[PDB]
Design a binder for these strands. Structure first.
Ligand SMILES: [Mg+2]
Lengths: 228, 186, 320, 228, 228
DNA sequence: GCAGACACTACGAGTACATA
DNA sequence: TTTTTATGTACTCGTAGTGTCTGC
C-alpha cells in the first residue's frame, strides 16, 4: 500500500474527529469520534493491504509528508509499521487495537427526512464566524419557507433564544415544522460542498453530510423539536 | 573537539557564548539546591525558652502547632491554640505558645503510619470500583480475602489501575512496582 | 553646598537623594567598606538588603556607580525575567567597552518569588560573564534571593546599626534635615522637632524626610508641631485606660464604638495589651480574646459580644 | 565594503553554528562552534576590508536584510560597526572578543579514509524527519556492502539498539569496518549537495561535508567503534 | 451603511490605539488611547449613518472580514448591529458610549513650533529596524541645521547616549535647540509620508503626524528638553 | 506553494491565602 | 536532632503547541 495526496487529505481530517484510527484492508476507511457524537466514512483511490492501528494519526501523517509519493508502507519485521523510501526506511509503532477507537460498523443511513444543501462558500463562512461570535451551538429550521441555519452561544444563551447568526440555504417544499440542533465541536469536516440529509424518528435523529470526497454523520442534540 | 588549544571554558561559558538555552538550563538547574525551613529555630525557641527572633520570619501556625504535638506535655496548650488559633495574630499565636509550653526539649522524629501500599492499593481500588468509601471498602477486602479469595475481584479490576490512580497512592518507582504487582499474582 | 538637589522633582524625599557615597548616612564599617570599594576601582558582586524600607540600599547602589563613573544599566527587579537575563542583560555584558568603564548592572528590588528561575539562571550567567561586568542587587527580604546568589555575592545588610551607629547616624540626619529646611525655605523655631522626626522613624530615612514634608504644611516647625510628631499613638488608649480602672459604665459605652471593624480592633488589642500586662495574664488574654474572636460572626449582637469581651478582660487581666 | 545576497545567505547558516562569528580581512569567512564540535569555511565574491568580531550574528544580518545592497559597512567612529543606507545610518554594537569564539586557524582535512556523497533531497529528509521521530543522534557504517546512516533516539535508546531511520547512499567499494556516531545538534549544514569525507584514527576522527557553497567538519562522539 | 476595504483598513489601525471606538454620524472618525498617550482622527469615504458604541472594535473588524463587500450594516431593530451579507445575516453587540473612551472634540493643533516631513519609505526603515536593534525610544533633534531622528535602546542606556540609529529628515531653517523624545509604544500610526508638526511650551508639548488619510497626535516623554 | 516567522493560547509548577 | 493536615481560589512565570502573516 502506497498513499496519495488525495488520500492523506482525508485522514488529516479524520484526526480531528479521533486522535487515532483503525483502518482495514480495502478501499474504505472510517474514524469515529470517541465520545460517539460524530462519525465519518469515506471511499478512496488507494487499497489497504493489511490491518493496522495507529494511535497517533497526526504524528504519522506528518512523517509521511517527509517521504516520497512512491513510498511503500507494509507490516514491518515485528508486528509494527515500515515506510520504504527509494533511498531510506522509516519505522512507525503499530498500535494495539485496545488503544484506538473503532466505529464497529458502517452505519447505513436512513431515508432522508429532509434534504437541502450547503456550499463550499457557506460552510466556510459558518465555521469561521462561529469562532469570532463564540457560537457553540447551531439549530437548523424553516424560516419563511427557506431552510435557515441559526446559531448562538449556548453558554450565555442557554435557551437558544438570542440568535447571533442566520444563514439562508435553500427553500423547503414539504409541510412540516422542525428544529434540529447540533453541537458545534461536532462539526468537523473538510471544506467544500455537502448534500445535507436531515433524518428524525422521534427522540432519535441525525444529520448526514454528503460530500464529493467523504461523507459525515453528526449527532443531533436532545433539544431538537419536530413532526416526522 | 578540534583546535586543541581552547583554555577549557567552564560549563557555563560554552552554553552562554554559543547561546543554547537548554544548556543554559541544565547549567542554571545546577544550582537548584532547595531546603530552607528554619521552623525549628522558632519551635526550639518555644521549648528552650530563649530569644524570639520572629515576625521578621515566616511562621507556620501548623508547623509549630504540629511539631509541638509530638510531646504530650504540650497538648493542653497546642489544643488551646486549635479551638482558638484561627484569628490569632501569627505573632499572638507565637506569644501564647511561649507563655504556655513550660519545659523544653525535643528530639526530632515525628509519628507516621505503616502503609502496606500493596494494601493501600487494594482498598482504593475497591473504593473506586464500587463508589463506596474507605471504611466499607475495608469490609470488602475481608469478605473477599475470607471468601472468594478475591483474586477474581483483583483479576477483573486490574484492568483499571490507571497510572494516574497510581499518582494518588504512593509517590515513586515503588508505584511502578505495584503497576506490575497487581497485574501479576491473580 | 554639600547637598545634592535633583531639581527635576518635587517629591522631596526624592529631590534630596544623595549623589556620591559620601553623602550617605551609613553605619561606620559599612560606609568605609564602600569607600574601600570605590578605591580599588572595580566593583565586586553585591547584594544590598534592608528589610526596613528606605535605608539607602537603592541609593548606595546608584552611588557606587557614580563614584566609579561606571556604565550602568538600572533595571526593575520585577522586570528581570528569564528572557531579560538571556536578552539585553547578555547583550550588555558581551558588547564592548572602549571607555575603560566598569560595567555595572543594578537590579533593583529583586526579591520576588517567581523569579526563582531568572535567579538560578543569573547565578550561572555570572560565571560566564563575570569578567565583563558586575552586579549590584537590591532586596528587602533576602530570602527572596536564591542561596546560590548570596554565595557568589558580597552581602551587606543595611538597617542593623550598632548602638553607636544609631547615635551618630541620627546626628548626621538631624543635620541633614536642617539643611533641607534651609533650601526648601522652612523655618525651625524648635529643633526638638527635627530630632523628633528622626528618632520616631529611625531605621527608615525615606519616611523620615517625607514626614518632614507633611509637617511643614504651615511653613514653620514650632513648639506646637512638636506636640503632633511626638504625640502618642494608637487610639486604643480609651479602652486600655478603662480596662486598667476596671469600670464598666465606660467600657459598656466604648463597645458600640469598635463594633464597626471588630477584626481590626481585636488585633490592635492583642497587640497593645501584650506589653501592658503581666506574663501569666498574657496566657489568659489570648484565651479570652482568642475565644471571643472564634465565636464572632456567630454572635447575634456584635456590640454586646464586644462588651462581653471587655468585662471578661477587666476581671482576669491584672497589671501595672 | 558591501555585502551580496550570496554572502548574506551563506552567513545565516554560519549563525546556526555559532551565535556570532570572528571574521577578518579577505574573501574567506569562518565560524567554529564554541563546544569545539563543528566548524565551517567559505570563500565568496565580496571583499572584507577590516577585522571585526560580531555578537548577534543572526541580528547583524537582520538589519542588513532591511537596507539596500548599496549599504556600505565601515568601522564606526567609536570602534563599533557603522552601516550607511540611503538617507540614514545604523550602528551595530561592536562585540568584545573576550566573549566571542571563532577558529584560531582553519585546521585542514586529512585525506578521506572513506568516500561517499549525499544528494540534496536526502539531507533535507534526514533533518525534517529528525523532528517527527525525535532523533538526536545518527550513525554511518556499512550494511550489505553499501554506506548507510541510522537514526536513533538516544534518550530512550541507551545502546542505540533500536533503529528508527536509515539512509542508503550507494555502495561501499572499500574493505574497512566502522561505526561512526554524530550528534544531531551539530549538523548545521545547508541544503544542496555534499560530497562526504570520513577520517579516523582509533580514538579520534571526524566528517567533512563538501558542498557547492561550503565545507563543514563535525566531530564524532565516543561510541564510534573503529579500526586502523 | 456599507464599509470598504479602505476604511475597514483604517480601523484595524485605530484598534491599536483603543480596543474600542466612538463613531458618530459622519465622514469623520476619531479615537484616543485610554491613557491619553495617542489620539487619531480621520475623514473617510464610506458614510456613517447612525451613532453607536463599539466595545470590541478589533473583533468586529474580524467578523466583517467574513462577509461580502456589499454587506449592509444597519442598527438592529433591537438596537445592536445587523450586518446583512447577501446570503447571510450577522448580529454584533453595542455598548453604551460610556464604556468606550471617546475624546470630546477633534483636538486642533496649535501653531506648530518647528516643522519637517518624512517619506513613506523612511518610516518603514525605522519601525522595521526598531525590533532588531531594540530601539524603544527615539528623538527628533537638529544636526548640522538638518533635523535627524535618533534611535536608542532605553533599557541599555537609560541616558539616551549611544545612539543606535539615525535618519536625516530635511533642512532645519529656524534657530532653536531641541530634543523631543517619543516612546516607540505610541507610534501606532499606519505607514506612508507625513507632514510633521511638533509644538512645545515649557513642560507643555506634543507631536502631530499629519498623514494623507488620517491625522496622528502623539505625546512626548518627560525627559524631553527644549527652549521655545 | 510552502516554510519561517512572527503572535496568543494553555497547561504545569510555584507560590500564597483563608476557613475547617 | 526533627520537617508538611484539606479545600478552594488567585496571580505569575515558563514553555510548548497552535496560528496566521509574510517572504523564493
Ligand atoms: Mg528601592
Amino acid at each position: 500500500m502506497k498513499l496519495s495526496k488525495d488520500t492523506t487529505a482525508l485522514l488529516k481530517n479524520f484526526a480531528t474527529i479521533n486522535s487515532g484510527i483503525m483502518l482495514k484492508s480495502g478501499q474504505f476507511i472510517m474514524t469515529r469520534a470517541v465520545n460517539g457524537t460524530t462519525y465519518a466514512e469515506a471511499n478512496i483511490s488507494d487499497v489497504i493491504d493489511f490491518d493496522v492501528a495507529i494511535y497517533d494519526l497526526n504524528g504519522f501523517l506528518g512523517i509521511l509528508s517527509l517521504v516520497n509519493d512512491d513510498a511503500e508502507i507494509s507490516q514491518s519485521e515485528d508486528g509494527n509499521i515500515k515506510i520504504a523510501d527509494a533511498r531510506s526506511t522509516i519505522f512507525w509503532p503499530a498500535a494495539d487495537p485496545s488503544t484506538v477507537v473503532a466505529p464497529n460498523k458502517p452505519i447505513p443511513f436512513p431515508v432522508a427526512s429532509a434534504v437541502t444543501e450547503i456550499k463550499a462558500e457557506d460552510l466556510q463562512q459558518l465555521l469561521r464566524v462561529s469562532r469570532g461570535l463564540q457560537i457553540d451551538t447551531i439549530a437548523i429550521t424553516v424560516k419563511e419557507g427557506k431552510i435557515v441555519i441559526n446559531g448562538f452561544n449556548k453558554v450565555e444563551d442557554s435557551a437558544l433564544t438570542r440568535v447571533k447568526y442566520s444563514l439562508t440555504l435553500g427553500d423547503y417544499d414539504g409541510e412540516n415544522t422542525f428544529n434540529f440542533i447540533i453541537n458545534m465541536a461536532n462539526m468537523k469536516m473538510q471544506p467544500g460542498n455537502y448534500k445535507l440529509l436531515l433524518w428524525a424518528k422521534g427522540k432519535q435523529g441525525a444529520a448526514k453530510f454528503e460530500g464529493e470526497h467523504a461523507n459525515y454523520v453528526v449527532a443531533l442534540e436532545a433539544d431538537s423539536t419536530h413532526d416526522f | 573537539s578540534l583546535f586543541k588549544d581552547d583554555i577549557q571554558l567552564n560549563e557555563h561559558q560554552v552554553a552562554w557564548y554559543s547561546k543554547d538555552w537548554t544548556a543554559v538550563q541544565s547549567a542554571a538547574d545546577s544550582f537548584k539546591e532547595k531546603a530552607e525551613n528554619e521552623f525549628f529555630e522558632i519551635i526550639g525557641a518555644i521549648n528552650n525558652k530563649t530569644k524570639c527572633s520572629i515576625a521578621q520570619k515566616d511562621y507556620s501556625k501548623f508547623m509549630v502547632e504540629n511539631a509541638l504535638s509530638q510531646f504530650p506535655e504540650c497538648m493542653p496548650a497546642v489544643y488551646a491554640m486549635n479551638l482558638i488559633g484561627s484569628g490569632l495574630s501569627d505573632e499572638a499565636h507565637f506569644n501564647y505558645l511561649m507563655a504556655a509550653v513550660p519545659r523544653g526539649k525535643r528530639y526530632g522524629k515525628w509519628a507516621k503510619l505503616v502503609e502496606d501500599s500493596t494494601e493501600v492499593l487494594i482498598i482504593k481500588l475497591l473504593a473506586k470500583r464500587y463508589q463506596v468509601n474507605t471504611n466499607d471498602a475495608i469490609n470488602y477486602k475481608s469478605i473477599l480475602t475470607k471468601n472468594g479469595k478475591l483474586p477474581l475481584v483483583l483479576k477483573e479490576l486490574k484492568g483499571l489501575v490507571t497510572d494516574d490512580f497510581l499518582k494518588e497512592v504512593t509517590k515513586n518507582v515503588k508505584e511502578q512496582k505495584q503497576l506490575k504487582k497487581l497485574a501479576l499474582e491473580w | 553646598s554639600m547637598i545634592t538637589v535633583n531639581e527635576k522633582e518635587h517629591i522631596l524625599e526624592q529631590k534630596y537623594r544623595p549623589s556620591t557615597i559620601d553623602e550617605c548616612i551609613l553605619p561606620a564599617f559599612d560606609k568605609e567598606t564602600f569607600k574601600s570599594i570605590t578605591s580599588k576601582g572595580k566593583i565586586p558582586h553585591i547584594i544590598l538588603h534592608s528589610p526596613s524600607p528606605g535605608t539607602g540600599k537603592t541609593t548606595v547602589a546608584k552611588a557606587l556607580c557614580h563614584d566609579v563613573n561606571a556604565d550602568m544599566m538600572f533595571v526593575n527587579g520585577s522586570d528581570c525575567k528569564i528572557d531579560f537575563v538571556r536578552g539585553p542583560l547578555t547583550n550588555f555584558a558581551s558588547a564592548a567597552s572602549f571607555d575603560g568603564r566598569q560595567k555595572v548592572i543594578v537590579i533593583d528590588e529583586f526579591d520576588r518569588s517567581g523569579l526563582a528561575e531568572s535567579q538560578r539562571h543569573l547565578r550561572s550567567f555570572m560565571e560566564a560573564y563575570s569578567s565583563n561586568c558586575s552586579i549590584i542587587i537590591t532586596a528587602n527580604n533576602i530570602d527572596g534571593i536564591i542561596k546560590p546568589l548570596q554565595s557568589r555575592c558580597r552581602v551587606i545588610t543595611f538597617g542593623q546599626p550598632t548602638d553607636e551607629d544609631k547615635i551618630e547616624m541620627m546626628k548626621q540626619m538631624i543635620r541633614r534635615l536642617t539643611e533641607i529646611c534651609k533650601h526648601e525655605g522652612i523655618a525651625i523655631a524648635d529643633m526638638k522637632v527635627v530630632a523628633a522626626l528622626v528618632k520616631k522613624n529611625f531605621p527608615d530615612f525615606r519616611k523620615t524626610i517625607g514626614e518632614l514634608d507633611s509637617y511643614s504644611s504651615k511653613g514653620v516647625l514650632d513648639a506646637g508641631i512638636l506636640s503632633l510628631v511626638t504625640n502618642d499613638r494608637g487610639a486604643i488608649d480609651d479602652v486600655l485606660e478603662s480596662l486598667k480602672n476596671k469600670d464598666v459604665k465606660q467600657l459598656r459605652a466604648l463597645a458600640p464604638k469598635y463594633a464597626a471593624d471588630y477584626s481590626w480592633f481585636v488585633g490592635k488589642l492583642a497587640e497593645e495589651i501584650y506589653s501592658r500586662v503581666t506574663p501569666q495574664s498574657i496566657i489568659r488574654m489570648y484565651e479570652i480574646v482568642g475565644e471571643n474572636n472564634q465565636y464572632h460572626g456567630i454572635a447575634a449582637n456584635t456590640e454586646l459580644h464586644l462588651a462581653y469581651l471587655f468585662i471578661q478582660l477587666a476581671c482576669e487581666m491584672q497589671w501595672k
